[PDB]
Design a protein around this ligand. Structure first.
Ligand SMILES: [Fe+3]
Ligand SMILES: [Fe+3]
Ligand SMILES: [Fe+3]
Lengths: 329, 345, 639, 142, 345, 71
């Protein structure tokens, strides 16, 4: 029992949150946990709000989980999403680079092309691909935003500072950090490619399948593999940039209500998980894709006691993030 | 890293607690900075430092070598205890026994439930993995702190039964700041408060007959102790060979793949001037000699020997040991191991 | 929440807390003769430690220390009247108590009676003490000082007794415990912490007597006077019976055999992390050891410390109180020997404590009566003491503590014998120290009579009283934390500084005979005034929302007190560096005190000493200014 | 550490004298942690919280100054820096006196050393307690 | 402020620069804290401090009394120069003259355009308001720094002509840290670099005949100077009476309405022990005596006399003076005056 | 701006600055035997002081001192 203040980013998430609140009220008893919705403009405002005791929980992509851990925020991961199936849950996913068929360029020929990113600092959309191109970037590589802006001939990198790095919002003027920007996130980054604004979209292996139902529409796209070849989109297991940890819900280190968070989500998945209810779905919405949780998730797993972001993310991934930040070639 | 050469300037060693640090410093000065010292308060923290290049190398008991391997480190050189000929292959391992007081007439292998136990530390081979896994296969649950009535198994939860016998300033720490920590600490624990100690076979001898001059052990006699045999009987300590729990892979030095070679070579070299050969250890520096007990290396360490192809933790520890530690996986409480096993590649 | 809320809450919480019980509990034989470094001592120590843990407060730890204490040797200490040979009458007495750190020796000679430990002042009496034992009353000053003066006049041996007028104790066969160290803490680790005895084991005399000092029972005093010709004056606000000098016919011999004894002091901490400046603390201390059962000397204090820690933690968890700065309670030990416990702790952060602790409250001897309400502190806490005495109502009288008839309240200076003194005079931490004192000091204080019984038999509503004390102490804490602005009166130092300049101008004549311009001092005093005026301004212009700009200011405030410690004297030599409240030639008061001698036309005035005193005392103040801002790089480049 | 090392070359002399030389290692260590936290806190702090950063940079800004022996008066020995200063408070000066121990002559002032070590220890110790340890360094055991 | 009584514990005085501060401190000690000292670097800042109760009282020249009044302060007691009988009404005012060197044959009233001038300070009566306003009515513009070629009129813009003769450490400050500041400073300025000084009539006498012992004035003779008469002629200094620019209201003490009474009473009392009556000023404290020149009060001050109903700045300064300062309003450069005249009530 | 920027800028600025001229200027008899506390000394002092002002940099002041030198 008691209320978990979920931090919703912008209108669409806010709408799904309110429906989430209402549906749980109808199934949960008076003595069960409940949801209240707190709307903010960006994930970064949700991170501050939780630290300031204005909200309690928010789901973040793993690259943002690192930032949330840093002082003075010190949030910790408490519940993880899992993908795949309930039968063989995967606590990771694949970062891929999607391009259109016959566009004629490999991964070593990206300079001067136009890029669509899910958002600044996110695993698949940013950390992995920029991490892989880092030394191909021209000096000076600090700040990163500027070297990236000079390598591609225009991008959409949501959450980046368009005032300071205008080329980063060339494909999505303003670099809006929420679903109000139609090119934000996995599906937004894919739309940026499909619409012809960009030449490459840095997304996850499931993105295209979530967006194109026909195999014949999907045959018009391919993946860039690290060996400078291209493969079809079904072949992501042998043509991907990296494997990355799942998105996770974070909470405060003190008075964080981690117990209630797990309690609420565990019940939520039981009533409203994949194919559970005709009334409401935790992992999909008529209002948008990946709102509050990713549409590709199949459920949740509780993170082990007192695990910090660094341990959760793993040495490798943490090393990569660090090396992007200072990083020496 | 344009066409470059030579990162092997100096090897940074990770040391637990105060004492190991002192010994390391001493080893630093004398080498002329070939050995550099980093410190931490726990074995797991030391492994973490090495994982993320805050340090390069440390020596470890087999049980911790397992964790280190799951965390991506590799064994480089093994500690050999049986011979002074450092070109010998690594031994098959040391004997792991259970020791009791002759005074105590009733205790036996099939009788442990209820008694008071003493362990080198949680996660070590002779102190935990061997004995706990063999008991586990009997009680088929993991509340070892409910099987024994009370104990001192350093590295356990500050408020379980298994920390109730500990003493060292830092109560129950997995390091030297706990008195009953290690092969020796567990023996003393036996001498002073426990009914059973899980340690290596050479432990009784190294601490009886005035060979150990601390007040608690100066007058102790090898004849005052027995071993528990798996078949329920008891035997004198001189009989480990026919009355031990299992064999335990020797402690081994670990590093990261990137630096394994560097580490090797500098150790093999340093051994030439600081190993068994040193006739007097109070005059010149000795790696395998410790002011206290077992700092950085086991004091009974004779040689650091090349692994001859067993350059992998599964390869070095061996199947049997792996199979045994795995069976105990479900009782782990190692925060570093869960960390190292999170990523799905 | 707002002040009213916290004030109201803290009150009802205080309305439902039995202080009398705990003052008693800390009297059970479980921990009664809780001498310094004794078992009982260690018992209560662990009690407090656990209680803190039970209070569910954040981090709580222990502070170990090995200091050399002095104890009564197996050989009996005694005073005996004897002529130029053998004892004719009888061994006056084999004192039941003793004066710690007293010179271990034995001597005999004449016996003068310099009322109230010579007071340094009283020494200006007829009969000379030039080579003769001396008697003094326990009072106006500290044994340490009493003895110090005695020896400064070349005396030997000193006896301290509790007369009848000053100490209305029915029993005259009562003996008390003494100190004798003209300092604070272990007398062999000045400025720097101690170690083992095995390591760094000097003997003494490092600011210690060098003259036997022995406490004597009134009864024994009676007898001494019995063998004295002289007659006690009326000037001495005493009463008949005492003489001035022993009858020539014979003299007295003092024999004290005490031995040093390394013990292990155990300080117990426990904090309550703040929410915005978690690393800026408010040290709340309380002596835990004692010679006798010390229900007063140590009971009430520790009693409050615990109950007071119990409340705030509770308020933080249950009531929603969010202290912007952390609170840290501390129960010191080995305090009967000069705050040895608290001092050696400070000794530990010789140059950083002020960066951490911004104020030290002290609960020692908080409840001793119900008439007056003495208060001693650093001018920086003046307005807090005031405004609080305006919020707390006397336990007995239904009226408020503050005397509404004045605009200028009375605040006393901290004495060498108050754990708070070191915090302020050595570590540069502003410190307060209240007392529900009485015109006459508690008698049973330093004796085996400091029982919870004889106390409550002498202060019926001890509970209500202790409650009040616990309230003023509470508000100080709430106040020093509640708000985002660090509320310390750094202005009061302008006055404190002007007062100096004034008193100094009364010697402008002497200052003139000497080439001294005394102009640089005014500049400093002024260069400092501006500094405060900016700080006092910058604050107003800053918003209680910019955690950054506020932190930058509060830190400046937090520097004020510390920076008045002469940066030209070594802690190892003169630990109390505070130019205003310290002790030494670096002391501001000490400057005038030397200059006053100029007029005496004799050599008593050391000119070279003055010259420097002024010179440095100037740059001390000057620096205090350049450190307190002036926007950095103070641009009064002209002059 | 270099100091500690060079100092261990006289562990023999240190032994003839009752000296434990244990408190020094503790300081050296109590200081190492201090830097390890700072070196950590930085990484976890964001170059956007002008506040948390200011609180850190200030700690860094203390490091150098705090190695000035707070036991010697500027008026007497102005170069207080235990490492680069000049005087008996100097760290190098300590060894420099100890070296004379072996010469078996009177050149070695033992009382001087005793203090030199004693204070030089607390100097380092203090440097630690000042450089953080999250304040109130809790190595209460020892 | 429930039924309360007595805020008149001590009066806080506002002092310019260093010297006035020293004098104030001295006055503090000796009074036993009846007088408290606050300091500022300019007259305007002092008036501001009093406006907002950071201080309570200061004495001021008529020109600054005008500003103080527009800023809401009131006059409390006047400085009387002519008599020692402190019950006398305030005088009609002091004589304001223009003084030149006898050496210089050509300068006269109708000749100023081009010459070098010396002023007590901007905004003061004898140094500025009287002479500048009478010149203004002639040149009908406000660039006085273009009428004179060069000058020292403390309180002017650091880089105008009118600051070019100044010297005091703080160049051109409206306080004692400028050498040529005040009645005396302006005279010295005349002696050393200017052609005309605007000061009070008694100034020459107070600084000639060895009455002023500073190097620059010790040998000066009253006969070395003349006054400029409005009609174009020149006359000896002994003739101010028939050769002055105008009368100038005496300097007066100001405070806020709230504290006027308190201020009065404590001043009248303090005068009893520290005024003209003190036979020796090097032994005991003297209000009207100054180590330097004119600190807190004018050194020629005799009595502080009650204002007898002229408790208002318009009332005390008088119509004529008001009318004159107003005509100069358009040339003000007083930042405090614009501030005090912003609100529309 | 980023390091490269500042590095690059600072370089070209350094690429167009005559240090040799000023090293010479500070040799003219205007300030040559610039002994400590001499007139020449005071000359260059005011030169630097003004140059700073001319450089249009923020606050710039003087620091006076009376020390005993030996001659
Ligand atoms: Fe993602
Ligand atoms: Fe082992
Ligand atoms: Fe005037």
């Amino acid at each position: 029992d008691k209320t978990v203040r979920w931090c919703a980013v912008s209108e669409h998430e806010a709408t799904k949150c309110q429906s989430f609140r209402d549906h749980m009220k109808s199934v949960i008893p008076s003595d069960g946990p409940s949801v209240a919705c707190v709307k903010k403009a960006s994930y970064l405002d949700c991170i501050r709000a939780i630290a300031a005791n204005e909200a309690d929980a928010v789901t973040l992509d793993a690259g943002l989980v690192y930032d949330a851990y840093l002082a003075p925020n010190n949030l910790k991961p408490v519940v993880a999403e899992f993908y795949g199936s309930k039968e063989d849950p995967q606590t990771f996913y694949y970062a891929v680079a999607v391009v259109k068929k016959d566009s004629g360029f490999q991964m070593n020929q990206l300079r001067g092309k136009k890029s669509c990113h899910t958002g600044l600092g996110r695993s698949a959309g940013w950390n992995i691909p920029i991490g892989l191109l880092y030394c191909d970037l021209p000096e000076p590589r600090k700040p990163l935003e500027k070297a990236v802006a000079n390598f591609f001939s225009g991008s959409c990198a949501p959450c980046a500072d368009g005032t300071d790095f205008p080329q980063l919002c060339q494909l999505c003027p303003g670099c809006g950090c929420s679903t109000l920007n139609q090119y934000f996130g996995y599906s937004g980054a894919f739309k940026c490619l499909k619409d012809g604004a960009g030449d490459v979209a840095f997304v996850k292996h499931s993105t295209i399948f979530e967006n194109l139902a026909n195999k014949a529409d999907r045959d018009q796209y391919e993946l860039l593999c690290l060996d400078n070849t291209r493969k079809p989109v079904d072949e992501y297991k042998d043509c991907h940039l990296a494997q990355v940890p799942s998105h996770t819900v974070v909470a405060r280190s003190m008075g964080g209500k981690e117990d209630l968070i797990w309690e609420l989500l565990n019940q939520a998945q039981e009533h409203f998980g994949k194919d559970k209810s005709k009334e409401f779905q935790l992992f999909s919405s008529p209002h948008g894709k990946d709102l509050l949780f990713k549409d590709s998730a199949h459920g949740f797993l509780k993170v082990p006691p007192r695990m910090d972001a660094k341990m959760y993310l793993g040495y490798e991934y943490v090393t990569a993030i660090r090396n992007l930040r200072e990083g020496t070639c | 890293p344009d066409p470059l050469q030579d990162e092997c300037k100096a090897v940074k060693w990770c040391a637990l607690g105060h004492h190991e640090r002192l010994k390391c410093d001493e080893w630093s000065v004398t080498s002329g900075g070939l050995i550099e010292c980093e410190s931490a308060e726990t074995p797991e923290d030391c492994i973490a430092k090495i994982m993320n290049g805050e340090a390069d190398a440390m020596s470890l008991d087999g049980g911790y070598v397992y964790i280190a391997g799951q965390c991506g480190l590799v064994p480089v050189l093994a500690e050999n205890y049986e011979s002074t000929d450092c070109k010998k292959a690594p031994e098959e391992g040391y004997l792991s026994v259970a020791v009791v007081k002759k005074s105590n007439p009733d205790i036996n292998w099939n009788n442990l439930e209820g008694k008071k136990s003493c362990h080198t530390a949680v996660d070590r081979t002779a102190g935990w993995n061997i004995p706990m896994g063999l008991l586990y296969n009997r009680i088929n649950h993991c509340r070892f702190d409910e099987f024994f009535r009370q104990g001192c198994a350093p590295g356990s939860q500050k408020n379980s039964s298994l920390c109730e016998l500990c003493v060292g300033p830092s109560v129950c720490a997995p390091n030297n700041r706990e008195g009953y920590y290690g092969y020796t600490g567990a023996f003393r624990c036996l001498v002073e408060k426990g009914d059973v100690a899980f340690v290596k076979s050479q432990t009784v001898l190294q601490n009886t007959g005035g060979r150990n001059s601390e007040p608690w052990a100066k007058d102790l006699k090898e004849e005052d102790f027995e071993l528990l045999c798996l078949d329920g009987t008891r035997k004198p300590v001189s009989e480990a060979h026919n009355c031990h729990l299992a064999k335990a892979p020797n402690h081994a030095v670990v590093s990261r793949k990137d630096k394994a070679a560097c580490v090797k070579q500098k150790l093999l070299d340093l051994q030439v001037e600081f190993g068994n050969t040193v006739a007097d250890c109070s005059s010149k520096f000795c790696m395998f000699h410790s002011k206290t007990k077992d700092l950085l290396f086991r004091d009974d360490t004779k040689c650091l020997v090349d692994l001859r192809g067993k350059n992998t933790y599964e390869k070095y520890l061996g199947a049997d040991y792996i199979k045994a530690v795995s069976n105990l996986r479900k009782c782990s409480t190692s925060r570093l191991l869960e960390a190292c096993t999170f990523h799905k590649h | 929440l707002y002040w009213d809320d916290l004030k109201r809450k803290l009150s009802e919480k205080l309305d439902s807390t039995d202080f009398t019980s705990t003052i008693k509990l800390l009297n059970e034989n479980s921990y009664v003769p809780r001498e310094a470094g004794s078992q009982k001592d260690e018992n209560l120590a662990l009690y407090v430690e656990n209680e803190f843990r039970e209070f569910k407060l954040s981090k709580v730890w222990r502070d170990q220390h090995f200091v050399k204490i002095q104890v009564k040797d197996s050989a009996q200490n005694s005073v005996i009247i004897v002529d130029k040979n053998g004892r004719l009458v009888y061994l006056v007495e084999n004192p039941g108590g003793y004066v710690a750190y007293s010179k271990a020796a034995t001597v005999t000679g004449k016996l003068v009676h310099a009322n109230f430990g010579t007071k340094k002042d009283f020494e200006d009496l007829y009969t000379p003490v030039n080579g003769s034992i001396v008697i003094v009353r326990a009072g106006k000053i500290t044994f340490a000082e009493k003895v110090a003066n005695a020896e400064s006049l070349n005396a030997i041996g000193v006896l301290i007794y509790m007369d009848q007028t000053k100490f209305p104790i029915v029993n005259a066969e009562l003996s008390f415990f003494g100190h004798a160290h003209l300092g604070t803490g272990d007398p062999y680790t000045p400025g720097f912490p101690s170690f083992n005895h095995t390591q760094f084991p000097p003997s003494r005399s490092s600011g210690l007597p060098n003259i036997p000092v022995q406490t004597i029972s009134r009864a024994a005093a009676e007898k001494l006077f019995g063998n004295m010709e002289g007659d006690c004056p009326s000037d001495w606000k005493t009463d008949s019976t005492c003489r001035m000098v022993t009858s020539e016919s014979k003299n007295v011999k003092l024999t004290v055999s005490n031995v040093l004894k390394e013990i292990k002091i155990l300080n117990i901490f426990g904090v309550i992390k703040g929410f915005v400046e978690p690393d800026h603390y408010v040290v709340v201390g309380a002596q835990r050891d004692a010679w006798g059962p010390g229900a007063a000397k140590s009971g009430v204090g520790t009693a409050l410390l615990l109950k007071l820690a119990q409340m705030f933690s509770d308020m933080v968890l249950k009531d929603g109180f969010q202290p912007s700065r952390s609170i840290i309670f501390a129960s010191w030990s080995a305090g009967d020997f000069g705050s040895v416990g608290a001092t050696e702790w400070l000794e530990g952060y010789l140059s950083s404590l002020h960066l951490k602790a911004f104020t030290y409250i002290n609960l020692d001897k908080a409840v001793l009566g119900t008439s007056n309400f003495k208060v001693s502190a650093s001018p920086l806490l003046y307005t807090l003491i005031e405004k609080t005495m305006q919020n707390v109502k006397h336990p007995v009288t239904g009226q408020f503590l503050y005397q509404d008839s004045n605009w200028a309240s009375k605040v006393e200076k901290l004495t060498l014998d108050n754990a708070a003194f070191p915090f302020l005079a050595y570590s540069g931490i502003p410190a307060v120290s209240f007392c529900f004192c009485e015109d006459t000091d508690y008698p049973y204080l330093g004796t085996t009579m400091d029982t919870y019984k004889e106390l409550i038999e002498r202060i019926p509503e001890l509970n209500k009283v202790a409650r009040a004390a616990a309230e003023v102490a509470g508000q100080f804490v709430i106040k020093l934390t509640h708000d985002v602005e660090l509320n310390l009166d750094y202005e009061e130092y302008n006055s404190q500084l002007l007062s100096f300049v004034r008193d100094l101008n009364q010697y402008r004549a002497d200052i003139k005979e000497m080439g001294l311009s005394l102009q640089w001092l005014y500049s400093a005093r002024g260069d400092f005034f501006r500094a405060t005026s900016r700080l006092t301004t910058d604050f107003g212009n800053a918003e209680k929302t910019d955690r950054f700009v506020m932190k930058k200011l509060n830190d400046r405030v937090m520097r004020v007190e510390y920076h008045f410690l002469s940066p030209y004297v070594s802690p190892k030599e003169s630990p109390f560096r505070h130019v205003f409240w310290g002790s030494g030639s670096h002391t501001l008061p000490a400057l005038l005190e030397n200059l006053k001698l100029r007029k005496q036309n004799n050599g008593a005035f050391n000119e070279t000493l003055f010259r420097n005193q002024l010179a440095l005392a100037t740059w001390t103040i000057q620096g205090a200014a350049n450190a307190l801002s002036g926007d950095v790089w103070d641009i009064d480049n002209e002059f």
